[PDB]
Design a binder for this molecule. Structure first.
Ligand code: NAG
Ligand code: NAG
Lengths: 83, 94
């Protein structure tokens, strides 16, 4: 047997990067191994590990002491590679 | 075990057409678990197990049915090799 796994991995991202001072925040990244298969015909399925739940959060930078929008990934799951 | 794998599996498919005699051929199907990952949208990395090399082959069926159109041709895709590749890339591989 082989199982499909998709997980939200803890990361630190650094927003940067304009003429202001960068900040580090805690986030998640999706990482996984979903099933895909391709069966031939005569004249097909793709899943990938992507955000299942996320939210937008504002991060304010000091210059040197602007706002930046960041995506907070909460959960991940195997979904159709379509969109 | 924590590795991405893409398997070209031997199959037998059956090619047919009404009023004709079916044929079985040997083909391969791709099956796998490629890595995908997403960072916070911008850098999406999507791989899937898809044909790396394929070809079109004609298969002729006999239709002992009929004197005009005693036989018929069908086009089939032969999958030769499979591999983890960037998603959305077209299956057909030549
Ligand atoms: C990962 O970070 C999240 C912050 O949302 C925290 O709740 C969780 O305890 C952490 N777990 C691990 C394994 O890093
Ligand atoms: C499976 O059939 C394919 C036909 O493309 C052939 O290349 C391969 O040698 C065969 N392998 C086995 C184990 O029968």
């Amino acid at each position: 047997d082989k199982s499909a796994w998709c997980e939200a991995k803890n990361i630190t991202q650094i927003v940067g990067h304009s003429g202001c001072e960068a900040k580090s925040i805690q986030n998640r990244a999706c990482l996984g191994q979903c099933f895909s298969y391709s069966v031939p015909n005569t004249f097909v399925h793709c899943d990938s590990c992507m955000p299942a739940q996320s939210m937008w959060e504002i991060v304010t930078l000091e210059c040197p002491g602007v706002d930046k929008l960041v995506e907070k990934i909460l959960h991940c799951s195997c979904q159709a590679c379509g969109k």
